Design a protein around this nucleic acid. Sequence first.
RNA 1: UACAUAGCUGAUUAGAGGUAGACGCAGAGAACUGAAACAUCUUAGUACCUGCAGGAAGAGAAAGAAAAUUCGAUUCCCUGA
RNA 2: CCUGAGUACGGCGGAACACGAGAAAUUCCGUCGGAAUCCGCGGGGACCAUCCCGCAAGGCUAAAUACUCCCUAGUGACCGA
RNA 3: GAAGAGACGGAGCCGCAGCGAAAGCGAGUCUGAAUAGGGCGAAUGAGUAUGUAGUCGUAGACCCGAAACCAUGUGAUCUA
RNA 4: GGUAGCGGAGAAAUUCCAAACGAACUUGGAGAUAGCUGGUUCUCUCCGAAAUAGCUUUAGGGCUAGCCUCGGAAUUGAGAAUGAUGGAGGUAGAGCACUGUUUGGACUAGGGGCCCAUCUCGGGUUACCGAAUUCAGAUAAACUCCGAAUGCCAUUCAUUUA
RNA 5: AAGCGACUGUUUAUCAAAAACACAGGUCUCUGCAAAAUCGUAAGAUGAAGUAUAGGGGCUGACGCCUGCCCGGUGCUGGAAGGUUAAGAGGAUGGGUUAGCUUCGGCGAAGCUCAGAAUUGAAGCCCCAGUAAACGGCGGCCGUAACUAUAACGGUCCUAAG
RNA 6: UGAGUGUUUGUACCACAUGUACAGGAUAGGUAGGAGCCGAUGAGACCGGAACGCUAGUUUCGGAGGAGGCGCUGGUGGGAUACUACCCUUGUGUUAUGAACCCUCUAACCCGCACCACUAAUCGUGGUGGGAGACAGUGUCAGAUGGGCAGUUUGACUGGGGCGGUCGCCUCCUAAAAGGUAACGGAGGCGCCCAAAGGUUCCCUCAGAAUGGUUGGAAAUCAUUCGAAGAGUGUAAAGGCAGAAGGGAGCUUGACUGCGAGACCUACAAGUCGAGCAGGGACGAAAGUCGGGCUUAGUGAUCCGGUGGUUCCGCAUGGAAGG
RNA 7: GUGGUGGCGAUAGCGAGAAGGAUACACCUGUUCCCAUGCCGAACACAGAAGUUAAGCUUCUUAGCGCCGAUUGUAGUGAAGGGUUUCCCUUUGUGAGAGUAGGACGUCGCCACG
RNA 8: GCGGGGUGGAGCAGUCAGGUAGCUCGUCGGGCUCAUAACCCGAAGGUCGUAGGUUCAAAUCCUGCCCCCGCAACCA
RNA 9: GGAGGUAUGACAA
Lengths: 534, 48
Amino acid sequence: MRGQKMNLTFGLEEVYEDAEFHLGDFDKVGIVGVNGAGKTTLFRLLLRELKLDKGKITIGNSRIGYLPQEIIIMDEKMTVLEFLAEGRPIKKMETELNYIYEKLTVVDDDKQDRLLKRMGWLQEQLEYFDCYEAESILLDLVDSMQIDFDLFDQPISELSGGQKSKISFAKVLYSKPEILLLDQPTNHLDSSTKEFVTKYLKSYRGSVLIISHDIDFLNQIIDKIMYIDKVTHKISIYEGDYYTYKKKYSENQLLREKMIIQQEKEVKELATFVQKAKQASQTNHALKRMGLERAIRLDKKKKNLTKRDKVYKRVKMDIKPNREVARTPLKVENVTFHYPGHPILYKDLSFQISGKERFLVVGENGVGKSTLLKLLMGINIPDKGKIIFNDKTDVAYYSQELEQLDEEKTILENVKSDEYTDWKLRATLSNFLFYDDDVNKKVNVLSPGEKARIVLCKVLLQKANLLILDQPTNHLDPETQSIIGANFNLFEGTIIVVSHNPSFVEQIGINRMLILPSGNIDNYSPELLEYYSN
Amino acid sequence: MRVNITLECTSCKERNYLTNKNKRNNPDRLEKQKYCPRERKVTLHRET
RNA sequence: UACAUAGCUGAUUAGAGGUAGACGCAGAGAACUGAAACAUCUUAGUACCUGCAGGAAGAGAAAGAAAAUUCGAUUCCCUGA
RNA sequence: CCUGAGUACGGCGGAACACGAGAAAUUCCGUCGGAAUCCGCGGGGACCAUCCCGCAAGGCUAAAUACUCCCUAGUGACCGA
RNA sequence: GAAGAGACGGAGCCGCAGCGAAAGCGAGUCUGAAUAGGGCGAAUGAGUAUGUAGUCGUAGACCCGAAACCAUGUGAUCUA
RNA sequence: GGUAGCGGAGAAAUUCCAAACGAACUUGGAGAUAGCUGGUUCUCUCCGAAAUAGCUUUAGGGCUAGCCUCGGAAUUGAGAAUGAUGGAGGUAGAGCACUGUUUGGACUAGGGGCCCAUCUCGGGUUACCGAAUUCAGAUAAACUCCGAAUGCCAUUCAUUUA
RNA sequence: AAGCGACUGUUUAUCAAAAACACAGGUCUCUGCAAAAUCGUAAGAUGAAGUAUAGGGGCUGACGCCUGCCCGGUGCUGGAAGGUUAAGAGGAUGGGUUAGCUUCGGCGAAGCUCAGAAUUGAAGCCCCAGUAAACGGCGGCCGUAACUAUAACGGUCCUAAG
RNA sequence: UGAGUGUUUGUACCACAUGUACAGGAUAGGUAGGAGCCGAUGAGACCGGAACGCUAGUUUCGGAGGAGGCGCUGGUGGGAUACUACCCUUGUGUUAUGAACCCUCUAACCCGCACCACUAAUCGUGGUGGGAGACAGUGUCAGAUGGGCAGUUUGACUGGGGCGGUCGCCUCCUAAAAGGUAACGGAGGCGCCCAAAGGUUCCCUCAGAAUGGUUGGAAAUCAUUCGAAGAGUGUAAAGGCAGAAGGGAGCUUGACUGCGAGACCUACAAGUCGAGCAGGGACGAAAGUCGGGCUUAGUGAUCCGGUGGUUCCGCAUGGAAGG
RNA sequence: GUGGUGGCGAUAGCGAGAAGGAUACACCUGUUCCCAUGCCGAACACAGAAGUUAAGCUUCUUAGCGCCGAUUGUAGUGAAGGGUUUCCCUUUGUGAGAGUAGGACGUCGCCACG
RNA sequence: GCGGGGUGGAGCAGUCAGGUAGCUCGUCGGGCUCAUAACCCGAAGGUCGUAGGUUCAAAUCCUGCCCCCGCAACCA
RNA sequence: GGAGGUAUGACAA
Ligand SMILES: Nc1ncnc2c1ncn2[C@@H]1O[C@H](COP(=O)(O)OP(=O)(O)OP(=O)(O)O)[C@@H](O)[C@H]1O
Ligand SMILES: Nc1ncnc2c1ncn2[C@@H]1O[C@H](COP(=O)(O)OP(=O)(O)OP(=O)(O)O)[C@@H](O)[C@H]1O
Ligand SMILES: [K+]
Ligand SMILES: [K+]
Ligand SMILES: [K+]
Ligand SMILES: [K+]
Ligand SMILES: [K+]
Ligand SMILES: [K+]
Ligand SMILES: [K+]
Ligand SMILES: [K+]
Ligand SMILES: [K+]
Ligand SMILES: [K+]
Ligand SMILES: [K+]
Ligand SMILES: [K+]
Ligand SMILES: [K+]
Ligand SMILES: [K+]
Ligand SMILES: [K+]
Ligand SMILES: [K+]
Ligand SMILES: [K+]
Ligand SMILES: [K+]
Ligand SMILES: [K+]
Ligand SMILES: [K+]
Ligand SMILES: [K+]
Ligand SMILES: [K+]
Ligand SMILES: [K+]
Ligand SMILES: [K+]
Ligand SMILES: [K+]
Ligand SMILES: [K+]
Ligand SMILES: [K+]
Ligand SMILES: [K+]
Ligand SMILES: [K+]
Ligand SMILES: [K+]
Ligand SMILES: [K+]
Ligand SMILES: [K+]
Ligand SMILES: [K+]
Ligand SMILES: [K+]
Ligand SMILES: [K+]
Ligand SMILES: [Mg+2]
Ligand SMILES: [Mg+2]
Ligand SMILES: [Mg+2]
Ligand SMILES: [Mg+2]
Ligand SMILES: [Mg+2]
Ligand SMILES: [Mg+2]
Ligand SMILES: [Mg+2]
Ligand SMILES: [Mg+2]
Ligand SMILES: [Mg+2]
Ligand SMILES: [Mg+2]
Ligand SMILES: [Mg+2]
Ligand SMILES: [Mg+2]
Ligand SMILES: [Mg+2]
Ligand SMILES: [Mg+2]
Ligand SMILES: [Mg+2]
Ligand SMILES: [Mg+2]
Ligand SMILES: [Mg+2]
Ligand SMILES: [Mg+2]
Ligand SMILES: [Mg+2]
Ligand SMILES: [Mg+2]
Ligand SMILES: [Mg+2]
Ligand SMILES: [Mg+2]
Ligand SMILES: [Mg+2]
Ligand SMILES: [Mg+2]
Ligand SMILES: [Mg+2]
Ligand SMILES: [Mg+2]
Ligand SMILES: [Mg+2]
Ligand SMILES: [Mg+2]
Ligand SMILES: [Mg+2]
Ligand SMILES: [Mg+2]
Ligand SMILES: [Mg+2]
Ligand SMILES: [Mg+2]
Ligand SMILES: [Mg+2]
Ligand SMILES: [Zn+2]
């Protein structure tokens, strides 16, 4: 993998400017960058989905296993087995091969040469992708992540976010690839599932490029770290782990900063002398002469004076509730719910939040965490029981899968609210790093991370006193995650949160944790690990 | 930002026309129905 | 230092130096000047210096010129321009 | 069986070819690397194939050519203190 | 051949065809999709060898004049 | 006796190195170069400038054009002068129709302090200050409702001329 | 009686004899000997037939009392993890040619050939520390006491230090 | 410029070991052959050791003993059983090694060390020790540093020169009613902008003032009247435009291709305008308009280089390189 | 007489007043129709003929404004001269602007209905 | 003419690179103290010199204007 | 029991 003079500019906002990178074979490369840096775009170039405006991107002929950042569900009714089976080209070739046979009967002596060649390639290709895979896939689920077979016959769209990530990850492995392009492979996974992925990737003998915002996950796997710069629009490749990249990077910007300081001092020195000559008497010929001579040096300095790159601005969140919380924001009493045709998730579930409380809904993948939150909002109607919100409680919902955005509309159109004027919307969008005509961009072209900011901005603009957040730190770059956690910690309201990120929950400072599926309203503590272990 | 640009004929890949556009006002590649002298007929020309 | 060799002695041999302020070959090799400035370039491989010469020197008997199909060492003059 | 080896040639750095590295052959110098040998080798202006021409890395060779310090005999719309 | 004229020597040069960057075509040719227009040409012809004079180019180039630059040499009998 | 010029020597002054040293002297390149100064030699005849435009590391230089001279070709004679006729243009002058500058008068929105009334609400006042309007009066290179004399362009025109 | 220079000396032969140079003394720094330094392409010399109490270089200039603050910048000295970096080594890939295949198509082995990335690659530079008798540098604004002035004193900005 | 040691590494053979997913007799690497094969050259079964191990077992070593097993066959599975070959993963070693470093060696090279001879000799050349040593020195190439040294550059206008200002382009006044016309004369602008703020068809007419009118005020939006331009015309000024060039809507891309009689301007190079012809279009019923924008600034010669196209050339020829 | 449609510098206009609809033109009645209003059949579009000259429109009166504008004189000025020469004057030719006498409430055509 | 500055009472940030008016001292009120100082707790104090543009949005960008400071305003 | 060592506060009253 090699790229030379890479250039890419979508409209007015550019991604790569004379960027270059060389990746040696058998390198577990960790791709790192802020949201929007262009990490996903790099894979699209490797997959030939995109074409560089200028420059050459060179890829090896080996087969590539691509794990998209977003799950590709062509149809809602697709079953898990259908989704996985599509990983291999067995089905596609057979449909083509079956047609070839039909043509052979119809055509006698005209197209036989072309048909025979096509049939031969399909047979050779089919045997190359040995048709015994039908059995191998069935057991790949068992050995991979303990994926139950009941899911195997279920529509994929109905799976949980963590479950979908397992299926998508398994599909990549099912394809039997030669180069691994993993785009956030652990976005929704729980702690246990992440362990399997880490171990497999450590053992994987081939090249694997990983786009991840999990530093610890990368450190265990990565041997080479590729940093996509958002301000310089360039690529830099370091040897080592995430920390090594930060150490090397922080030093380079420090050494660059000191260079710019000294160049400014020399310019100021000349400038100061030029001014002294400029204001001297016209009768002081020698000083006037020297002033013009130094004016020439000053001009040449100012033309070779390196510009300091504008440090990328970090998100600023100020979430405040309009109204005040009550002692009983939310009442859940004897609530039972089951998805038609599936086991009851919880029976007679009853809890009561206190107000300005950090309430954590703990659990594992596919246990009902997101179902419970959907239950509170009203998306799901409880099979039994009642859910009562105090009249003082305003609720803001952050869905897990980013289902609250219109892909067709623009950023500004999405955030449009009856309670906010235009400039008010722009100011907040600037706090979320959407500057000027960046707000007229269609939501369909944004990255998952940039979309997550829009959803958060919608939550902020509500000014609700109860925050129902379902994995808020998902898709966010590590810097933005800490800002999110720190600001929520200071939030003066009740927070119902779900998060598989240990760091984020620590910053928020959880008070009570609700374990699933075994309903257990408990005081928050390092005993969370005990429930996870058990 | 206003920049000079070239309109290439889609049919023949011929860079027939030179023009200019404001990137901010027209982020997407400009497309016009212009006469292609090589093909001697109107064709779709897209910026490159 | 043993054989030797080196040194030393003798005999034998052929060089030294000068020109014709010319001509030839070679080593080394400027600057003013021109470019309307100036560094690449030009003056110029010139002036100067040094070596070797001969009456001439140098070159010369194709691992060539060509592609009319062919020519048949070298040198010099006309022409190509 | 013989037909010129640390050679031809190549990299690097210079130089000579009208040709200033240029697409640049051809020739030479220094340094390093470094062939084939008749089914072989070189050249025909990068390079390759075909075709044509030639046979390097050894030597010698008169004449046509350059010059006149001198000697002999003359010449001049050359000088005339 | 007298340091001559002259004789031989037709290799070569100029002119008799131009247009186009070039392939190329030719009283035309180039541009152009074009029998269009337009450009340059032909229609609408005089050249060439030599003498002479004017002017120009290369040469010191109408004559005299630097401060200087460069390359061999000669100078410490004054003076340090 | 030694140190020699791309140098020497210097208790240091650019000081000395054969009577002038910010780089000795002599010969050669060499007739260096000099957009600079000086000089450039007989006669008569015909005609006779320019000191301007443009560009220029250009400004006391140069190039093209303009102006002079010599020869030639050709024309529906195209030049000059004057007249007749027709036109383009905004100057002198003048004017205020616009735009600026501006004087006095009338009226006045409005603004100023005085008191009553103050919830500062309404007066009544300075021949208080006063926009706009209006009357009268000026003013203009970068004002014009107007507008010459002249000059200019042109005419198959006329007369004279070349 | 004052300035300058401690002093005797030296200097612009030929407009300057001096406060200029030298000087003894001070200090810094280089130099372990085929020393450093210098002349020279080299050989060979001086240094020195000397050896750190010696030799070279910079500054200051008897003697007496003293010689404050700043190592941020520039030099020098030391450091060696990291970044950057030449030739050379290396040779993944991509062109040119064509034996051969080929569905006008087009593909294409070997050889030769034109380019060539990864990787490797010293010093230096960046970086860290020290060094001022190394090159150098050595601040502002506002307010305060019993008349008034002034400010011992108080704020605050800047700097490597004021 | 040559020997070794060791270390860390890259390569290549050669030995070794390893292959357990579901089913499957069970630890099934792939392919090919395979009915037959192996064992008194010590088989089966048994026992101990060791290894691997997915914990199920597999491999190997040995004690005794002595003759046997395995395969085919059979069912499983996608794949079948022995054994052979070709190999393929994984991790052990041997060898060949190639590098990087490590020191050690000695014979090259070096000695302004000692002694010996040439020999009168502080030169030199040899000889013997000693020291050092593949370093150093030297050659070629490369980076760094390098006023120590060298060749040069370091504007012009200008009420002298300096300082300040200016240098190209557009508009006005100066400018003397054609055009042109200077000053370091008086004023300003430009180095763009517009995907409509372009084209076309259709449609519309402004600024202000008075009166009335919730929030609402001098002044937001609304209505009548008065209103010839006192508005607007992207952007300076002048000229022009209300038969619009100002404003709105629909459709569009003529902000076209090849040109171009003839004009203006002009030292040249350039600059400006252009009916009209053809090709193929936009709008409109048609007429007809359209080769950008109300007009006049919004720009830069050549050389050199980049990208794209091309029936052009291609140094014997075909290509190519390069034009 | 009216309605279309043009030429000519508004001497054609504007303001004010008066008269007329027989036809014609208009207002005028409606929105089902093609068609339409960034809302509105107001407008545009279409259908239609109950009423009215009220307005527009036509004709007529008026010089209030606007417009046109002779002559005389003057400013300037070409040419030729002068002076006491930043200016001024004379001869000759030309001659405004302003201010006025006055002009003028249009004229010249074609069509269709009368 | 050349520069530097106008942000709460004072000294300063912010400004380059448009989104949110801060830091130090001070003032006011209340605490602590026998009282004062220090200290502790609350509060006030600017729409960024001013007027216009640019922008969805200006302390920030553009133009002008007014103030304050240093310098210059002439050389043989 | 003894001995040598290890922040501010006029003045008078
Ligand atoms: N078709 C597009 N049009 C306009 N902008 C685009 C388009 N595609 C991508 N961009 C921009 O490219 C930028 C970077 O691309 P990319 O989506 O790969 O970022 P990312 O690092 O992968 O995001 P994240 O890490 O949060 O998943 C995005 O901010 C996105 O706004
Ligand atoms: N619309 C649905 N239809 C049918 N079954 C569903 C549906 N949604 C969820 N399920 C099932 O509910 C179970 C849990 O629901 P839920 O989406 O809340 O999982 P979760 O707690 O969010 O897990 P995680 O977020 O970690 O992936 C899943 O197994 C999932 O298969
Ligand atoms: K001679
Ligand atoms: K020269
Ligand atoms: K010159
Ligand atoms: K010879
Ligand atoms: K060459
Ligand atoms: K040849
Ligand atoms: K040959
Ligand atoms: K033609
Ligand atoms: K023609
Ligand atoms: K003749
Ligand atoms: K002649
Ligand atoms: K001469
Ligand atoms: K001459
Ligand atoms: K002497
Ligand atoms: K002296
Ligand atoms: K006026
Ligand atoms: K005027
Ligand atoms: K002295
Ligand atoms: K002294
Ligand atoms: K003293
Ligand atoms: K004296
Ligand atoms: K002296
Ligand atoms: K002292
Ligand atoms: K000293
Ligand atoms: K010093
Ligand atoms: K001393
Ligand atoms: K310092
Ligand atoms: K320092
Ligand atoms: K090949
Ligand atoms: K060596
Ligand atoms: K003067
Ligand atoms: K339009
Ligand atoms: K109606
Ligand atoms: K009426
Ligand atoms: K009238
Ligand atoms: Mg992404
Ligand atoms: Mg969930
Ligand atoms: Mg020159
Ligand atoms: Mg002889
Ligand atoms: Mg040459
Ligand atoms: Mg060589
Ligand atoms: Mg060759
Ligand atoms: Mg032959
Ligand atoms: Mg001869
Ligand atoms: Mg004589
Ligand atoms: Mg005589
Ligand atoms: Mg001598
Ligand atoms: Mg002597
Ligand atoms: Mg001096
Ligand atoms: Mg002398
Ligand atoms: Mg010469
Ligand atoms: Mg005469
Ligand atoms: Mg006047
Ligand atoms: Mg003295
Ligand atoms: Mg004395
Ligand atoms: Mg003297
Ligand atoms: Mg004297
Ligand atoms: Mg001194
Ligand atoms: Mg110099
Ligand atoms: Mg020179
Ligand atoms: Mg000058
Ligand atoms: Mg002056
Ligand atoms: Mg004029
Ligand atoms: Mg005139
Ligand atoms: Mg317009
Ligand atoms: Mg060829
Ligand atoms: Mg050839
Ligand atoms: Mg009149
Ligand atoms: Zn085309």
